[PDB]
Amino acid sequence: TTALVCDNGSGLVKAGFAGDDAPRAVFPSIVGRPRHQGVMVGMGQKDSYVGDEAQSKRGILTLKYPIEHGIITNWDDMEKIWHHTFYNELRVAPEEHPTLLTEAPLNPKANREKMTQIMFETFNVPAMYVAIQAVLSLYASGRTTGIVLDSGDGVTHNVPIYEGYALPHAIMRLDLAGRDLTDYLMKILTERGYSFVTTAEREIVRDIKEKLCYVALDFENEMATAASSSSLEKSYELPDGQVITIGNERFRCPETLFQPSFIGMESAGIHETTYNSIMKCDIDIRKDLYANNVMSGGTTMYPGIADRMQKEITALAPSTMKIKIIAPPERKYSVWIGGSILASLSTFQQMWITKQEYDEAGPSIVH
Amino acid sequence: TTALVCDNGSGLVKAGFAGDDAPRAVFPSIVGRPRHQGVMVGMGQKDSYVGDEAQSKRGILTLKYPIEHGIITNWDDMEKIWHHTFYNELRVAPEEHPTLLTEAPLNPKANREKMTQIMFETFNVPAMYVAIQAVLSLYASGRTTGIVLDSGDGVTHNVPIYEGYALPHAIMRLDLAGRDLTDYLMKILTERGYSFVTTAEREIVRDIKEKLCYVALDFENEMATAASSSSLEKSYELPDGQVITIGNERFRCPETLFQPSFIGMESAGIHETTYNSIMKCDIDIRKDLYANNVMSGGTTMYPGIADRMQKEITALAPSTMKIKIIAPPERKYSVWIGGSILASLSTFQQMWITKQEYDEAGPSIVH
Amino acid sequence: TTALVCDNGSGLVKAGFAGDDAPRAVFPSIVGRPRHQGVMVGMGQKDSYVGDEAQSKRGILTLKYPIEHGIITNWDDMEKIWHHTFYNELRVAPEEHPTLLTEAPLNPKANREKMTQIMFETFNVPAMYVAIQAVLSLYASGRTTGIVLDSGDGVTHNVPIYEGYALPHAIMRLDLAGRDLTDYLMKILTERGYSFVTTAEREIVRDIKEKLCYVALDFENEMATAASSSSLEKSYELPDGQVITIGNERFRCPETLFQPSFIGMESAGIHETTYNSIMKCDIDIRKDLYANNVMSGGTTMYPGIADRMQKEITALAPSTMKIKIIAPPERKYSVWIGGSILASLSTFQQMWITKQEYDEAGPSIVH
């Protein structure tokens, strides 16, 4: 049997077998219990709706993302995510396949152990391994050097890798993008009188965060032309018939990635965390970290990136240095195409942690 | 044995066993004591005549509807309604059947308790349950979403239901239609010189409220053509031989449902209470409340509804929204066909409150 | 001349010159047009009655609060509020005094601009400034740190301030209390058979919301003693002679502030919004947000607050932390005593926006 790559998204959990095209299942991670009393008599209602069904049944449930700030809320809901994914999307039994699971870089111990341990006893997989989402994006882009960005709602990361070794002393985790950008967009859309305070309605905010937002070339000059009469406004239509016109806030929300002072948080922008991680690496290596700046994750899919990022880095970086920023299409599925390449390779079959070895070793094998 | 669905009409009490055709007994709720002295010597006269016999013996009695403004006048007369219904119409003993009783939405406490308690000790039914008349109209129309209208003489209601949960925060009770429309018709028929002030004669007013009245497409334009010489007049014949010709007031009386300022009451029309209840529901749900607007109750059987209601809602509702108003034939028996479907279903047999459980629990089981 | 502090209440507009005792004018914000035709011949009737005269002429008018959900309905009625206030209560010309106006925190743009702009051209004030009602309550209590609560009919707010800087990332606006508590009280008083559906009569509901309601120590245990025979009932007398006896609903209505699930809204109680705003502030600052919890606004004048709030916060907050909740008398006039202190200080005279500067700058000076 065929191995299964299942990505523990922050979004947007992604699932598909090993090779060779695209993921089979992608869905918004949400679990939602019903906040109102039923009067139908069937009864016909589920105890907890997962996505996609919880995104079709908005407004009668209370949506709860099971992974928040890069860590799982409880494994009771997480197990339901897994069960739903394997059985009613992929249509496969875990006993049939070796699996490949993903994690986030700088995640607290003992949450990789507890995960691995529960998943082996609950789903009875014959072998498993847990890879960080950032490392996998190297394979997806066909690179062997560069700084890797796993940016999902709501934890971004900046990991530098050099042919083909990782540098522990320069790894940066920012809790900045993207769920706090969702919350910030909701705070500056209230300023235009649209009240979307409720949990369900927050998903609609997320959808306009995808579609209508853009990044400026320079903030001050976009603000200048905003003061002018020329329309930057785009009109969105809402499920109850309402028409929302956003303009100024449209470029304000993504610009936060370069200026976190908009949220009021002390942390520095992607601009400077890129530079400061490069300048924590040895002198000879710095040469090839420039021009292997590879963006990844769905929250980097705004149009004005990477050429904003490019212009800003080129201004702070040493003169006459070659800087190219690598941003392909499909960054949301980058991780999955990474994992797919990995699990197909020899000899990594023998790098998987198998059940008998796990049973003897216990949680200490993980690291 | 076969369960019995007995509807506590405002009209028009309705009774018939569970399934599958139509009600067996429908009658005008009136009790009437004799207002004149008897000289026949038989004597042969009843202490209180119920309907139908009190509608055949008009003019020698004083008709008193036992339910007024959605609440029962006294249980002394109500028990006679029940006794008459079970014994001399349906021909059944309550000890033979589990019953299903109806109520009105937003009815004061403790009037469901006192009812339930008296009915168990007086009629000795083996089990019972009390459903609100509005919820039952969902089943009758085969829907699972929509705003439900229980409109009888003289309390209307507007209850929003979404698949398959009820929304408590948007429930509206209007004391507007229909008995006040009966009283208003009597006030604008006196304007044409016909004096029908007495209690018995008020039933005749109710009968012309059924048959001859109609709703306009637009008030102002119907008023315009009323000023013209073309006849809108219909000639009714009265039991003593009199011929009554009504025209202008013919469309004025039902138009009150869209304009309560005709009665002088502050409350807003069905038009606006429909809109304002929809706009008290969550944004995603509003989409399916439009086009599941379901009218019910006999007082909605005027010809110009629903296409008046349609035109008015479409003008106030957001542009490009799909609005269909659902109004089938037989709306007066909607409630009964609802109840019939309910009481036949498994597992609702075990939702009935049985006598032993009631005896242990007391009136606190009701809610 | 003496500066004038005029508070844009949600209630309850408040007005009085700068220093040193109490407001001169307080009145219920209502404007009401006459819903019936006049037959007196004088004629003697006003086009629109404002409060107090619209609270003496109840039942012949249709009361409309000009500010609803924290935003003004139209400036046509708002200007009449202002005109009435300055001229026929305060007896002062706006050209004589610099004014100080108030607003609500998280109010949509461009409603501070449009207000400021209209007020300068209509009333011709020589200078003005607009302060949010929450910030002013710090001065009133003589504090320089703490979370400030502006709670009026029907928008509450939770703003954290630290010596002497404001924290934008933790500001919470709840549309929960108090006008929806008025509407909820009307919905659970109909349950006891008293029908107060009309606009005028809604004011009477508001008056019993003030006087007779109380907060429980614990809901479940107050509900227990409610099931007991001991009287919690208080008897109110109504203008037409009616005696109303409320008990259970008496503690149910204010308890909604800790449990919004009673209205069916998804939002969390003051308990948790207090905690969750504190836990969105930096670690060192959290220490002094506890014990500077300052309540304000008239809708916090229920007797069981703050010691309900105290017991609930102490249960959720970390162990051995000092928590004191600051609730002085006169919370309804807190805002005014705040404003009074502010406008008297040097150098804040030079913080006022003066007419010549406004004329040059235009609406862009506001922020």
Nearest-by-CA chain A residue for B138? A40
Residue A311 CB neighbours (<10 A): 14
Classify residue B302 by its DSSP letter: -
Q: How far is it, in rounded angstroms, from Cα A286 to Cα C4?
A: 65
Q: How far is it, in rounded angstroms, from Cα A34 to Cα A47?
A: 8
Q: Which chain C residues have a beta carbon less than 8 Å from that of A195?
A: 175
**Structure token digits, residue A29:** 């991670």
Residue B21 identity (one-letter amino acid): D
Residue B52: cis peptide before it, omega within 30 degrees of 0: yes
Q: How far is it, in rounded angstroms, from Cα C234 to Cα C250?
A: 9
Residue A250 CB neighbours (<10 A): 21
Q: Is C21 exposed, middle or buried (0-12, 13-18, 19+ CB in 10 A)?
A: exposed
Q: Which chain B residues have a beta carbon less than 8 Å from that of C262?
A: none
Nearest beta carbon to residue C106 from set A190, A264, A265: A190
Residue C319 identity (one-letter amino acid): S
Q: How far is it, in rounded angstroms, from Cα A254 to Cα B57?
A: 81
Closest approach of chain A CAs to the CA of C150, in angstroms? 18
Three-state DSSP at C331 gives helix
Nearest-by-CA chain B residue for C180? B169
Neighbors of chain B with 3 or more C-beta pairs under 8 Å: A, C
Q: Is B164 on the interface with A (CB under 8 A)?
A: yes
Inter-axis angle of helices A248-255 and A179-189, to 10 degrees? Answer: 150
Three-state DSSP at B137 gives helix
Residue C302, CB half-sphere, CA atoms under 13 Å: how many?
30
Q: Is B319 on the interface with A (CB under 8 A)?
A: yes
Q: How far is it, in rounded angstroms, from Cα C96 to Cα A252?
A: 42
Cβ neighbours for B327, distance < 8 A, ≥ 6 positions apart = B294, B295, B300, B305, B306
Q: How far is CA A115 from the centre of its chain?
A: 19
- Inter-residue contact C333 to C23 (CB < 8 Å): yes
User: Given the DSSP bridges, would you call strands A25-27 and C61-64 parallel, antiparallel or unpaired?
Assistant: unpaired
Nearest beta carbon to residue A263 from set C71, C169, C267: C169
Nearest beta carbon to residue B266 from set C62, C191, C193: C62
Residue B239 CB neighbours (<10 A): 9
Q: How far is it, in rounded angstroms, from Cα A19 to Cα A241?
A: 43
Q: How far is it, in rounded angstroms, from Cα B32 to Cα C330?
A: 60
Residue B160 backbone dihedrals phi, psi, to 5 degrees: -85, 130
Q: With CA atoms as reference, report the closest residue to B134 among B171, B85, B82.
A: B171
Residue C65's DSSP bridge partners are none
Residue B252 backbone dihedrals phi, psi, to 5 degrees: -65, -50
Name the structure determination technique. cryo-EM
Helices (H), B47-198: 53-56, 75-85, 113-123, 133-140, 179-189
Three-state DSSP at B83 gives helix
Q: With CA atoms as reference, report the closest residue to B131 among B296, B294, B366, B345.
A: B366
Q: How far is it, in rounded angstroms, from Cα B349 to Cα B336?
A: 18
Residues 196-215 of C with CB under 8 A from A: none
Residue B152's DSSP bridge partners are B155
Residue B207 identity (one-letter amino acid): D
Residues A64-99, buried b or exposed e (16+ Cβ, 10 A)?
bbbbeebebeebebbeebbebbbeebbebebeebbb
Classify residue C32 by its DSSP letter: E
Q: How many CB pairs under 8 A join A and C?
A: 25
DSSP per position, C201-264: HHHHHHHHHHHT----SSHHHHHHHHHSSS---EEEE-TTS-EEEE-HHHHHHHHTTT-GGGTT
Q: Which chain B residues have a beta carbon less than 8 Å from that of C192?
A: 108-109
Q: Which chain B residues have a beta carbon less than 8 Å from that of A42?
A: 164
- Inter-residue contact B78 to B146 (CB < 8 Å): no
Nearest beta carbon to residue C266 from set A35, A190, A192: A35
Task: Tell if the CB–CB gap between B169 and C265 is shorter than 8 Å.
Answer: yes
- Inter-residue contact A128 to A352 (CB < 8 Å): yes
Interface test with C, best of A197, A199, A228 (most C CBs within 10 A): A197
DSSP per position, A299-316: GG--TTTTHHHHHHHHHH
Closest approach of chain C CAs to the CA of A101, in angstroms? 32
Cβ neighbours for B206, distance < 8 A, ≥ 6 positions apart = B153, B182
- Write out B206-237 in H/E/C secondary structure: HHHHHHCCCCCCCHHHHHHHHHCCCCCCEEEE
Residue A295 backbone dihedrals phi, psi, to 5 degrees: -80, 150
Closest approach of chain B CAs to the CA of A161, in angstroms? 45
- Write out B220-287 in H/E/C secondary structure: HHHHHHHHCCCCCCEEEECCCCCEEEECHHHHHHHHCCCCHHHCCCCCCCHHHHHHHHHCCCCHHHHH
